[PDB]
Design a protein around this ligand. Sequence first.
Ligand code: CA
Lengths: 13, 279
Amino acid sequence: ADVTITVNGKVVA
Amino acid sequence: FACKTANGTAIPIGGGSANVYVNLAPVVNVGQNLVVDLSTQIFCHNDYPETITDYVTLQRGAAYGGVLSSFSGTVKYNGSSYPFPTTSETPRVVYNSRTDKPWPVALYLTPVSSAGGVAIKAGSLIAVLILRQTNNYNSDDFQFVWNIYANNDVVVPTGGCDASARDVTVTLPDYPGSVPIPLTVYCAKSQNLGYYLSGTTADAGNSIFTNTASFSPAQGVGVQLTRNGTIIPANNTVSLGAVGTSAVSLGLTANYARTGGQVTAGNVQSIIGVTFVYQ
Ligand SMILES: [Ca+2]
């Protein structure tokens, strides 16, 4: 890939 | 104590602000120095040199627009060099004549690594320089604010089509939520660009990228990229079209998407590739 996208998320309780 | 620009605009006794319009080198590359010499446009003079001596300084200098995001710099004042944007008040220059003399200020700006294409666009605010005037007479402490604008486009040489960054990481709000993704592209010569996404998906529509996290991973959810209100499946060409020296956004947005189960707490991570298609 020309660009790599890292997508950080989080689910709380 | 008064000041005046080369293009008419002046600032009277007591301080005040003024917009300066400077011509810039339309092409500047890495290692080369873009020089904004303001000793040819900003002039000042002492109104009562027979009784009062004026003291003038470059109090603070801030970078804006393309200078702030594509240029590292120093500032020349009365022969001495200082960090730009400034972090301390400079020594003073004495003004003791009614004859309008140059304000000894110059900007030395070198392009950074990420610079390329139209780094400084026309009519855009490139700097703000605060002159500070005092005297040995009164307790006058006046500020002459100078808003430095670029008259023209400044292009950082680039070869072919290059993207904003190679590693773009974006953080999502706690489930659920969405985030814009800061990703741009610029081409030296205007070319028709497209692009597609790559990665591992969990759905039949091949759009919901799997949560790659192996620390405390949250199940049930994944990441889905959207553009112009429309979900972009993996391996699906999105044509940006005519792309030139101006940055053209890919318009991506990171979203949460449901797998087909029930969402549990924990980390979420997806590594999505962007590959450009030419012609
Ligand atoms: Ca490329």
